[PDB]
Structure formats: structure tokens, C-alpha cells
Amino acid sequence: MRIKGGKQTRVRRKKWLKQASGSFGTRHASYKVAKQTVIQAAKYAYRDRRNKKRDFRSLWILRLNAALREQGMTYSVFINLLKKHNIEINRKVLSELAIKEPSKFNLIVQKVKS
Amino acid sequence: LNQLKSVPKARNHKTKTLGRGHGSGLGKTSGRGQKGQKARKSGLTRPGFEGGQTPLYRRLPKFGNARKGFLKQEWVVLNLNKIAKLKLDKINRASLIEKQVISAKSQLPIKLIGHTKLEKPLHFEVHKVSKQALKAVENANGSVKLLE
Amino acid sequence: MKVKSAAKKRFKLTKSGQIKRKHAYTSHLAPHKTTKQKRHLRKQGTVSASDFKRIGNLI
Amino acid sequence: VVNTLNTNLEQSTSNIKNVQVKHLDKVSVRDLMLANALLVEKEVLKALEGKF
RNA sequence: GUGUAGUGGCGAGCGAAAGCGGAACAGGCCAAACUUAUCAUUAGAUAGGGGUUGUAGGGCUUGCAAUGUGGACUUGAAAACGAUAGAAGAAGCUGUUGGAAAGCAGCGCGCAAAAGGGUGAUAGCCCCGUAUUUGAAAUUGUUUUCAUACCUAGCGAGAUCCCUGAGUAGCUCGGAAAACGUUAUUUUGAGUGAAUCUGCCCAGACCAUUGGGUAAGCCUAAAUACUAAUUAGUGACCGAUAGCGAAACAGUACCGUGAGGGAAAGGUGAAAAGAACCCAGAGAUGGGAGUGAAAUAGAUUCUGAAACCAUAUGCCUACAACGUGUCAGAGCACAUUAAUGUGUGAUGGCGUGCGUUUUGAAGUAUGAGCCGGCGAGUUAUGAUAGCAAGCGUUAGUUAACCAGGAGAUGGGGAGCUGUAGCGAAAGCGAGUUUUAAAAGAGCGUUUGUUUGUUAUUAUAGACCCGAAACGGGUUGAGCUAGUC
RNA sequence: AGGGGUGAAAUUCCAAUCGAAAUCCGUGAUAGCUGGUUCUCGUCGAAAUAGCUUUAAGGCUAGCGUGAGAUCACAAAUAAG
RNA sequence: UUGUGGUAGACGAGCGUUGUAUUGGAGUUGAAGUCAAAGCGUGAGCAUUGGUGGAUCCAAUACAAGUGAGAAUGCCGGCA
RNA sequence: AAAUCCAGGUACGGGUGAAGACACCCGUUAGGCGCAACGGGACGGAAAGACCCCGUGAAGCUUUACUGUAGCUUAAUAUUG
Ligand SMILES: [Mg+2]
Ligand SMILES: [Mg+2]
Ligand SMILES: [Mg+2]
Ligand SMILES: [Mg+2]
Ligand SMILES: [Mg+2]
């Protein structure tokens, strides 16, 4: 018994090529390059799915530092004024968003002054 | 039993296909290692081989075959530890052919052997009887005739 | 699968495995060895379990 | 299944692709568990009981 | 039997003969004694008779019983069964989609035929066949019958009678076949060389005893091996990069001085109804027409991917350092296998490919231009191990072979393993070897078998590809070297 | 006419090839040496040392991995004395 | 409750392909194959609709293998 | 037409790095795209390094290396008195 099987190979390569669309040049045409680029893209996806929560926290810190620097104290002093006194688990983003709807944030920053 | 669905209990085991990729394991190297003599086609040198070092068989001295060129003369043997389970009296070739232990087309001499005590009397007609086997058979108030 | 001829003449096989063998250093030089060594080596002995695999399939 | 292998019967059922007639000594395990309906003749029982 | 006894730089390796179960089965005839006829009968020759061997036979002298089986076989006659062309060979209409129905559906029907091929799409009943029943002037095959030649037949008695295969068997020198690396047995290139039933040879050097067989002359069907060929047919075989190298005008075209090497490619449609005619054009051709179910079936002819080359809606891009993507994210344009949607993606953060081999490669180490296809741990026969199954404590189990649907299976116990080991061996025996030792120690004082499947392994090329080479047979001195 | 030929000698020439032609066959030569060896998920997870080797780029055994099974307390670990 | 990085490498469970067997069944009211799409799965992989195409094919359980390609300065064809 | 070619949108300095970088790090410079030129580089291309080494690899050649041998020569024996 002889088995040729050109169906399965083409279907597999078609899936790999379909994965990489919107790629420059031949990367979406030739399969040999498409597989390399899909592998590399998924590596980058795995690394960035961690780097982005590494970075968004930093952005929230930055936009909280800026808001507090216009009241007379720094972010590195505000965190004490949440943990030790008036123990609060308000998150590190929402205290950021509260500036985009301000004058409810000022209530926070003057509440810890007690 | 419905050939349309015929099933066993368990016989279909992991078939190690050696060269069909990595996901199954056993892939490109195929279990042959990396780049040795065994890796190449037809590795696995001569069965007894220590690679130049004089092998165990060559190192050891040879057993002597005293009765050279002959074959040991076989015996048909009647042990007493089992012959009790066989139910028969007047043991001989003429009945051992019937009880299928011996064969009719066998001109072979008969020996008796074994220490185990036996209850009922049996009359043996054999070519050799041990000292204590003969003693055991006679303590059962049987007899043994030693054919010449 | 033919039995290795130069083996079946050196390893008599007993009941329940336990390949049997003679000892070396008994053919050539008497004086260089001692009496204790000579009468220890006359008695035959078994094969180390390391070589048991190499020999069992060699018979 | 038949013991004496009658000839009027097998003259029929030969043009029928479904059915088939066999002497007792010519039925196999596959040929029997494929039947899905069979007609045993009263004689072969005496034979069959002997063969177990 | 057994991978045994043996043989082997006792290494690699090699490997019988008996015995046993089976397929098939047949044993005949000369030379020589003696006799006949004839050869200048110097026959020591020519043609006859006779005779064929081992519990020895035959010839020589003398009697009895024989008319017959038997074939390894000559001619005729008759008959049967085949081979080579062929003859007959049952059974159906209606409706719907439909280009065409043989489908699908309704109601029937025939069968020793529901094997197969065709018919506008998948037919038991449209056709051609098949099952079955049949038939040969001529040529040929196998068998049988009757006659017909040639060959072939049996039990005794007597007696120093004669014959019973000569440069032969042996012995020696060098070699070999046989399982044996030279050894009984068997053969022989050289040399020598016997005996004659009270004999000769043989039973692993050799002699005696016992026992077996009679060389040195010929012939022999059957079982066995193989199939380019003829016929019928099959395939868990290939289906145009396969399968024979070859589906076609293939050993062609082509390469070579020559031996020799040696390819690729098939499909309109059911049927040519092969596309009259018109326009453009020099014309091929193209665009309408026309046939047709479809002309995106049009002779580039089944389907028609990818790499690749062009066109186009939508979005972005001409201060920008880029393994070219990813995570965020605006604006823009659309609207779905209804989804916290789709395409592009100004701009931020981040980011030195894949296999290979290597201590370690982004690699200034190597492989791949790109796409598609082809392409690399299988098979036979045995070994051990794991798992599962059948069968079981005088267990288990068949091989070859025979019958069978190119079947499961039934017969077939010859053998295989296990049932008592130990010992180099005779031997002994739940004991046994060593030993003076019955102490001591070694080894033993029961846990089976046959298959299935899987892993590993052995001999075969044994995962695949890869040498330079080695040997054997042939073709070449039309260039060049020499000679004529 | 090729384990040959020819050579005013160079290892020249022998059909664009000659330290021993060309093609066919044994033949699928052998290669401890390069290169290649094609589907997935899960569990576990090393060595790059010792001895010997006409051996040192290879091989055998031990060491180290894994699977199946037993030992389950006196065995193996981890701290103090 | 203790865990779940991993080459060589051991072990386990699995997807797919081609065909055979029986069992169901779809098909000119358009089968496979082929492209396209804004689906479903833990993966090998699997559906749905439409255009093309114009006759075979799908699922369930066993069975058998020329059974699974990105690399061999791989072979053949095509194309840059 | 060709050899070449992992995909490419293919800067420079200092440093680092399998030790000499288009890509990495930190600075610096640079609108997009051709044409004629020249050759510094991309350890450019063509050749599985000719040297060297390794393989229990090959061939050719040598010799008071080994084992054998065609030839040449010597003796017994047959041809044979
Ligand atoms: Mg490799
Ligand atoms: Mg003798
Ligand atoms: Mg790979
Ligand atoms: Mg290079
Ligand atoms: Mg270069």
C-alpha cells in the first residue's frame, strides 16, 4: 500500500501562513519564512504579556507622582500615608484614574493628613 | 459478538516510531545518541567484545570434555515424588505406553529414583533402582523386579 | 542465532542461571604463585553479575 | 448449516449474494458471528455436542 | 535431530552423518566360466546360446514342476475424456428533478444468471455476456480396452571341478571432496603393486574375535528446480515524480569513434454538432454569431494550488537607523462563521532568525535562492524481557505433509520445553562434586507451557546518502608515440 | 592494448582523462568519518569521570538517568550531643 | 496536600493519512479535490457558508502499513 | 546570459561579544530614488584546504621488513638400454 498525502502538508502550511498576515515582503508568501516569523512573534507575545504589566504599573506610578507633586508631597511619602495611617488597600491605578476625575482625588490626598 | 464493534482487553502498546519528529520524542537522533560508532548504520560490534581488551571468554581456561565424541546415554526416569499421583499398579513399559508418559516407539531403558514415601503398593519392572528408593518401595509392602 | 563456539566450551550453565566457570592463572607458572593461591583457584566459581548480561545472550 | 450437503438447496441461494450454505465442518468463527440469522438442521446437534 | 557431536590463528566463524515423521517407489542388463559356426582358425577375433550374484550365486553331471504373471516396453483396431473456431441462453413499465435517469419514488417480474463491460448520471429485467445445456469436417493430447511382438518364472540331488570385472584395491610423495584447516572413508598428478570363497573390503590410526557387504562394468520413470511462453483469473499491488527503463512508433530521440549510457510527456464532449457567417487585421488570432446542458468545455483542450508577474477599491509612507515583529495607541475606511468585531497602523516601550555541530554561535563557522512533489529504522528466520489470552499438575504443544473455496480448520505426537540435580566423565540420586572425611564449602532439595502484541538484540546492504579504491570480462592506436 | 603497449626518458602518450585508460559486472564494496533522519501533549531527567583498550574523534564494564517490583524500620536523609 | 523549566534519553496517552472488513448513511436538488471568510478545540487537528468543479464519499469499532517533511553543497519540474 | 542568494526597509565612532560587528550597548550623522565611476568592506564569489594533523584509509615506489612466487640452477625417480 502506498500513501501520498499532499492534502495534510498543504493544510498545515496553510495554517502557518495564515497565522502571519500583515507581514512585510515575502514573510506572508513563503512558508519557511512564515514559520520563523510566527515562532518569533509568539516569543515576543510571551515576553510582552509580562513586560506590559511590568510597564503599566510604572506608568501609573509616574502619573501619580505628577499629581502629588502639585500638592506639596511626593509619591514616595504618599505610600506611607496609605499603609501605616488609615490602612487603605486602594489600588495603584485607581488612585491614578481619580485625577482624570479630580476634586474627588483631593479628598484622598488631604484625608491622609491626619 | 458484533464484528461492527470488536474490542480486545489490552494488547496495543506504545510503538516507538524512531524517526518521525520530536513531539513524539525519539526524533532526529532517533535514540542512537550523538555521533558515535553506535550512531552510524550497523553499530553494535560483535556480541562478545570489549574492544581490544582480551574478552572474558578468551581470558578464561577451557572446560575439558572427557568422553570426547560421544553422547550421554539418556535414561527414561520414574521419580517417586510424582508417580504417586499417577494411578497405576504393575509399572512397566507395556502400561507406560498406555499412560502416555513413555512412547511405544521408544526402545529406551527405565530407571527408578526418589526418596518420597508412597502409600499403596506398586510393582515396578525397571532397569535400575536406587538404594533408598528400593527401600521406600519395599516398606510399602510392594516389590521391585530388576530387569536384566 | 548460533551459539558462540568459543563460549559454550568455557561457561557451563547450571540450574537457575548462575553461569559456571573455571578460574584463570592455573595453566602456566606454578612457582610464581603460592600454595594458598593455587588451591583457592582450583575450585570453580560463578560469573560476576556485570558480565552475566554479556554472557547470557552469548549462549 | 447442513450435514449432508443437499444440492437442491445450494442450487438456490447461490445467486443470492446475502445468504450461503455450509457443511458443519466449514463454518468458522467469523463465518458464524457474521450470520445475524441462521438455520441449523436438526441432525448436526448430535455432531456438535460431540465436538464441544 | 540442533545450532548438537565435532571442527576452527580453538578467534571470527563453520556445521554434519545416524535415528525419526513424511511426498513418491522399480529395479533391470552385460563381462567371465561352458557350449555353437566361421575366420592361412597360430584368434588372443566375428555373430549365436547361456548367465548376473551374498540367508553367496552361476556354470558342469541328473531329475521333477512349468505354461502362467510381468513390465523400465513394438505395432494395429475400438472406445472414452479433453485442447484448438462457436450455438441457444429468462425477466419492466409509469411519474419527478433533469441536457440525457439506468438514480429517487410507485406497482411488478425472473433466476442453476445479483461475475463483468458498455448504454448521455449509480441498471438483476436496454444490449453484450455469465450460470446452465450443448456441438468438430481437420489437426493434436491423456487414458482405457482387445490382439500383437522382444524380454522375463520354480523346488531338489552330486562335489578339492571352473568362473565371479588388474596397472585394479592398496603402500609411498605432493593436493583436494567430505561438516572436519587432511584424518578413518572418497577422489588423484608421480612411483611401486596383491589375493581369489579357508577369499576381498568395512564397523575414525591399528591387531585379534564377532558381525555386516561383495568393489574395480552399464541403464533407470516418479517425488524435485525453473517459467520469457498459451489460456482463464486473482490481488487489504502501482495508478503518469508511481508502476517494467518504456501507458505514445522506447531501448526511440539523444551522448559517445566504441563497448556502452539513456530520458520526458496521457484525459475536449456522451457525440465534432472541430466553432459556416460578420467586424478589425496582411495573417495567425481576437471579439459577436452558431451548435451544445456549460464555449471560465474551443482544440493552450478533466480538475487547475503555490512560488511567480501584472491591475484595482480601502489605509499608511518622501528627518529617517529598521532579524522588520510584538505590547500599547491615535486618526482613517468599512461592516462580520455577532463577536469586549474587521483592514491599514502616524507615535511610545521592547526586540542580534531556523536546522546542524559545539565548552559556547546573531555569528566574521557552516546548509538551504523560492514553491510543489519524491526521499531515510522495514522484512524473513531465531534469542531474552514486559503485558494480555488459552490450557494446566504425569502438564502444554505441533512442524513437514494430506483433504479443503489459491480458507479458519480436521487429521498428523516425529519432535520442543518443563517434570532431579550434581559431576570433566563412568556414575550416584533429593542428594551430589571435591575429600581419608559421611565434617566444611560449591550446587541443588518445583513453579509450567503455546500463541498475540511491544521494546531490545543476532545473520542477511539492515536507518539513509557519501568515497579514493580492489578484482573479473570486454571496447578502443580514426588524436598522439613507435615500427612497417 | 591496460598487473599491458610505446617511450632520442618528461612519469611522456595510449580518443579533450594516465604514479597506471574507458565502460559493464561482483556491488546496495567498506567507511570507528561528515551530512540528513518527517506528527502532538504529558511525567521524570543525566554525564562530559575511574579501569582497560595498536586505544585516545571510537568500544566494554562500573559511575550518573528512566520504567516495573520489593525492602517500609534496624535502610537513606536533615539538625544537636 | 505536594508539585507542573529542560537537550541527550526512559515511560504513558493520543491526532491524522491509505486501504480491507462488517454496521449506519449522504450524493447531478451537485461528491471528493481547490481557493476565500471576521469559527470551535489543551495540541496534533476539526467543522460551517459561498464561488469553482462535475462523480464519488463521510462518521463509529477493529485490522494492515510504501503512514506524517524546512534543512541531506538532496533528486525532478517550474519560477524569480 | 552568468556565477551568487536564510527574509531585509542593509550608516559612522567608542565599547562589548565565539576575542575584528549594518543590526547588540552608549553617542553621532543622515530627505526618497537613480546614472557614470573606483574598489576599502560585507572575514565578497568560484573550489567539502593542495599545506598540517587524524583514520588500525587508498594507491605508486623502494629494500639485507615479513610471507610466498614466475624464472634460473642442483639432486632422486619415470621416460630407459
Ligand atoms: Mg548528526
Ligand atoms: Mg572400529
Ligand atoms: Mg527538525
Ligand atoms: Mg564559506
Ligand atoms: Mg571567499
PDB file of N, CA and C (backbone and C1' of nucleotides) in Angstrom, chain F residues 19-20 32 34-35 54-57, chain H residues 48 53-57 59-61:
ATOM      1  P     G F  19      48.868   9.549 -13.481  1.00  0.00           P
ATOM      2  O5'   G F  19      50.102   8.673 -12.964  1.00  0.00           O
ATOM      3  C5'   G F  19      50.129   7.302 -13.274  1.00  0.00           C
ATOM      4  C4'   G F  19      50.416   6.490 -12.038  1.00  0.00           C
ATOM      5  C3'   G F  19      49.684   6.923 -10.799  1.00  0.00           C
ATOM      6  O3'   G F  19      49.302   5.836 -10.003  1.00  0.00           O
ATOM      7  C1'   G F  19      52.010   7.152 -10.453  1.00  0.00           C
ATOM      8  P     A F  20      47.754   5.561  -9.669  1.00  0.00           P
ATOM      9  O5'   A F  20      47.131   5.259 -11.094  1.00  0.00           O
ATOM     10  C5'   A F  20      46.983   3.889 -11.480  1.00  0.00           C
ATOM     11  C4'   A F  20      46.952   3.745 -12.976  1.00  0.00           C
ATOM     12  C3'   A F  20      46.760   2.299 -13.431  1.00  0.00           C
ATOM     13  O3'   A F  20      46.038   2.307 -14.674  1.00  0.00           O
ATOM     14  C1'   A F  20      48.823   3.022 -14.161  1.00  0.00           C
ATOM     15  P     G F  32      31.399   3.447  10.141  1.00  0.00           P
ATOM     16  O5'   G F  32      31.656   4.034  11.567  1.00  0.00           O
ATOM     17  C5'   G F  32      32.830   3.589  12.170  1.00  0.00           C
ATOM     18  C4'   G F  32      33.035   4.330  13.475  1.00  0.00           C
ATOM     19  C3'   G F  32      33.850   5.603  13.320  1.00  0.00           C
ATOM     20  O3'   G F  32      33.493   6.547  14.347  1.00  0.00           O
ATOM     21  C1'   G F  32      35.127   3.905  14.441  1.00  0.00           C
ATOM     22  P     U F  34      32.942  12.634  12.548  1.00  0.00           P
ATOM     23  O5'   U F  34      32.786  13.518  11.233  1.00  0.00           O
ATOM     24  C5'   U F  34      31.515  14.134  11.093  1.00  0.00           C
ATOM     25  C4'   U F  34      31.427  14.942   9.853  1.00  0.00           C
ATOM     26  C3'   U F  34      30.021  15.431   9.581  1.00  0.00           C
ATOM     27  O3'   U F  34      29.690  16.607  10.303  1.00  0.00           O
ATOM     28  C1'   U F  34      30.896  14.493   7.615  1.00  0.00           C
ATOM     29  P     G F  35      28.231  16.804  10.906  1.00  0.00           P
ATOM     30  O5'   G F  35      27.341  16.659   9.626  1.00  0.00           O
ATOM     31  C5'   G F  35      27.298  17.705   8.724  1.00  0.00           C
ATOM     32  C4'   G F  35      26.366  17.381   7.606  1.00  0.00           C
ATOM     33  C3'   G F  35      24.948  17.003   8.025  1.00  0.00           C
ATOM     34  O3'   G F  35      24.109  18.124   8.289  1.00  0.00           O
ATOM     35  C1'   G F  35      25.754  15.430   6.448  1.00  0.00           C
ATOM     36  P     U F  54      46.138  -2.409  23.050  1.00  0.00           P
ATOM     37  O5'   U F  54      46.108  -1.337  21.896  1.00  0.00           O
ATOM     38  C5'   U F  54      45.296  -1.591  20.749  1.00  0.00           C
ATOM     39  C4'   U F  54      45.745  -0.767  19.561  1.00  0.00           C
ATOM     40  C3'   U F  54      45.284  -1.280  18.204  1.00  0.00           C
ATOM     41  O3'   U F  54      43.991  -0.821  17.784  1.00  0.00           O
ATOM     42  C1'   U F  54      47.574  -0.920  18.133  1.00  0.00           C
ATOM     43  P     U F  55      42.689  -1.320  18.559  1.00  0.00           P
ATOM     44  O5'   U F  55      42.455  -0.230  19.678  1.00  0.00           O
ATOM     45  C5'   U F  55      42.428   1.109  19.279  1.00  0.00           C
ATOM     46  C4'   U F  55      42.119   1.947  20.506  1.00  0.00           C
ATOM     47  C3'   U F  55      42.426   3.423  20.305  1.00  0.00           C
ATOM     48  O3'   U F  55      41.331   4.071  19.638  1.00  0.00           O
ATOM     49  C1'   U F  55      43.299   2.674  22.399  1.00  0.00           C
ATOM     50  P     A F  56      41.531   5.365  18.754  1.00  0.00           P
ATOM     51  O5'   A F  56      41.891   6.467  19.846  1.00  0.00           O
ATOM     52  C5'   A F  56      40.810   6.940  20.600  1.00  0.00           C
ATOM     53  C4'   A F  56      41.093   8.104  21.496  1.00  0.00           C
ATOM     54  C3'   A F  56      41.968   9.189  20.880  1.00  0.00           C
ATOM     55  O3'   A F  56      41.464  10.479  21.203  1.00  0.00           O
ATOM     56  C1'   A F  56      42.955   8.400  22.873  1.00  0.00           C
ATOM     57  P     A F  57      41.369  11.616  20.054  1.00  0.00           P
ATOM     58  O5'   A F  57      39.892  11.433  19.495  1.00  0.00           O
ATOM     59  C5'   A F  57      38.743  11.498  20.359  1.00  0.00           C
ATOM     60  C4'   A F  57      37.478  11.599  19.540  1.00  0.00           C
ATOM     61  C3'   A F  57      36.933  10.233  19.093  1.00  0.00           C
ATOM     62  O3'   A F  57      35.520  10.183  19.078  1.00  0.00           O
ATOM     63  C1'   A F  57      37.289  11.659  17.237  1.00  0.00           C
TER      64        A F  57
ATOM     65  P     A H  48      33.658  21.448  -4.425  1.00  0.00           P
ATOM     66  O5'   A H  48      34.099  21.574  -2.905  1.00  0.00           O
ATOM     67  C5'   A H  48      33.497  20.774  -1.905  1.00  0.00           C
ATOM     68  C4'   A H  48      34.102  21.113  -0.563  1.00  0.00           C
ATOM     69  C3'   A H  48      35.289  20.219  -0.228  1.00  0.00           C
ATOM     70  O3'   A H  48      36.176  20.944   0.636  1.00  0.00           O
ATOM     71  C1'   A H  48      33.562  19.815   1.307  1.00  0.00           C
ATOM     72  P     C H  53      51.717  16.153   9.230  1.00  0.00           P
ATOM     73  O5'   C H  53      50.503  15.900  10.208  1.00  0.00           O
ATOM     74  C5'   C H  53      50.610  16.381  11.509  1.00  0.00           C
ATOM     75  C4'   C H  53      49.296  16.223  12.225  1.00  0.00           C
ATOM     76  C3'   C H  53      48.588  14.874  12.149  1.00  0.00           C
ATOM     77  O3'   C H  53      49.067  13.995  13.161  1.00  0.00           O
ATOM     78  C1'   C H  53      47.055  16.583  11.684  1.00  0.00           C
ATOM     79  P     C H  54      48.969  12.453  12.994  1.00  0.00           P
ATOM     80  O5'   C H  54      47.427  12.180  12.997  1.00  0.00           O
ATOM     81  C5'   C H  54      46.756  12.321  14.235  1.00  0.00           C
ATOM     82  C4'   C H  54      45.289  12.007  14.085  1.00  0.00           C
ATOM     83  C3'   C H  54      44.972  10.672  13.404  1.00  0.00           C
ATOM     84  O3'   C H  54      45.005   9.570  14.291  1.00  0.00           O
ATOM     85  C1'   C H  54      43.666  12.364  12.446  1.00  0.00           C
ATOM     86  P     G H  55      45.265   8.161  13.723  1.00  0.00           P
ATOM     87  O5'   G H  55      43.980   7.903  12.839  1.00  0.00           O
ATOM     88  C5'   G H  55      42.753   7.681  13.521  1.00  0.00           C
ATOM     89  C4'   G H  55      41.669   7.258  12.536  1.00  0.00           C
ATOM     90  C3'   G H  55      41.742   5.856  11.912  1.00  0.00           C
ATOM     91  O3'   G H  55      40.454   5.271  11.889  1.00  0.00           O
ATOM     92  C1'   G H  55      41.609   7.489  10.207  1.00  0.00           C
ATOM     93  P     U H  56      39.954   4.419  13.138  1.00  0.00           P
ATOM     94  O5'   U H  56      41.085   3.325  13.321  1.00  0.00           O
ATOM     95  C5'   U H  56      41.170   2.251  12.354  1.00  0.00           C
ATOM     96  C4'   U H  56      42.603   1.890  12.060  1.00  0.00           C
ATOM     97  C3'   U H  56      42.762   0.749  11.074  1.00  0.00           C
ATOM     98  O3'   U H  56      42.679   1.221   9.735  1.00  0.00           O
ATOM     99  C1'   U H  56      44.230   0.420  12.901  1.00  0.00           C
ATOM    100  P     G H  57      42.572   0.167   8.510  1.00  0.00           P
ATOM    101  O5'   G H  57      42.742   1.106   7.256  1.00  0.00           O
ATOM    102  C5'   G H  57      42.351   2.471   7.372  1.00  0.00           C
ATOM    103  C4'   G H  57      41.943   2.980   6.015  1.00  0.00           C
ATOM    104  C3'   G H  57      42.950   2.763   4.898  1.00  0.00           C
ATOM    105  O3'   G H  57      43.091   1.415   4.459  1.00  0.00           O
ATOM    106  C1'   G H  57      42.033   4.909   4.736  1.00  0.00           C
ATOM    107  P     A H  59      45.447  -0.234  -1.705  1.00  0.00           P
ATOM    108  O5'   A H  59      46.226   0.611  -2.803  1.00  0.00           O
ATOM    109  C5'   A H  59      45.564   0.886  -3.992  1.00  0.00           C
ATOM    110  C4'   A H  59      46.299   1.896  -4.837  1.00  0.00           C
ATOM    111  C3'   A H  59      47.760   1.656  -5.216  1.00  0.00           C
ATOM    112  O3'   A H  59      47.835   0.813  -6.367  1.00  0.00           O
ATOM    113  C1'   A H  59      47.483   3.869  -4.485  1.00  0.00           C
ATOM    114  P     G H  60      49.194  -0.035  -6.689  1.00  0.00           P
ATOM    115  O5'   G H  60      50.323   1.075  -6.825  1.00  0.00           O
ATOM    116  C5'   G H  60      50.293   1.825  -8.027  1.00  0.00           C
ATOM    117  C4'   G H  60      51.440   2.794  -8.079  1.00  0.00           C
ATOM    118  C3'   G H  60      52.822   2.220  -7.792  1.00  0.00           C
ATOM    119  O3'   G H  60      53.415   1.504  -8.879  1.00  0.00           O
ATOM    120  C1'   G H  60      52.554   4.233  -6.620  1.00  0.00           C
ATOM    121  P     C H  61      54.482   0.321  -8.633  1.00  0.00           P
ATOM    122  O5'   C H  61      55.664   1.073  -7.904  1.00  0.00           O
ATOM    123  C5'   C H  61      56.421   2.021  -8.607  1.00  0.00           C
ATOM    124  C4'   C H  61      57.507   2.528  -7.687  1.00  0.00           C
ATOM    125  C3'   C H  61      58.371   1.502  -6.947  1.00  0.00           C
ATOM    126  O3'   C H  61      59.383   0.914  -7.743  1.00  0.00           O
ATOM    127  C1'   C H  61      57.718   3.223  -5.457  1.00  0.00           C
TER     128        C H  61
END
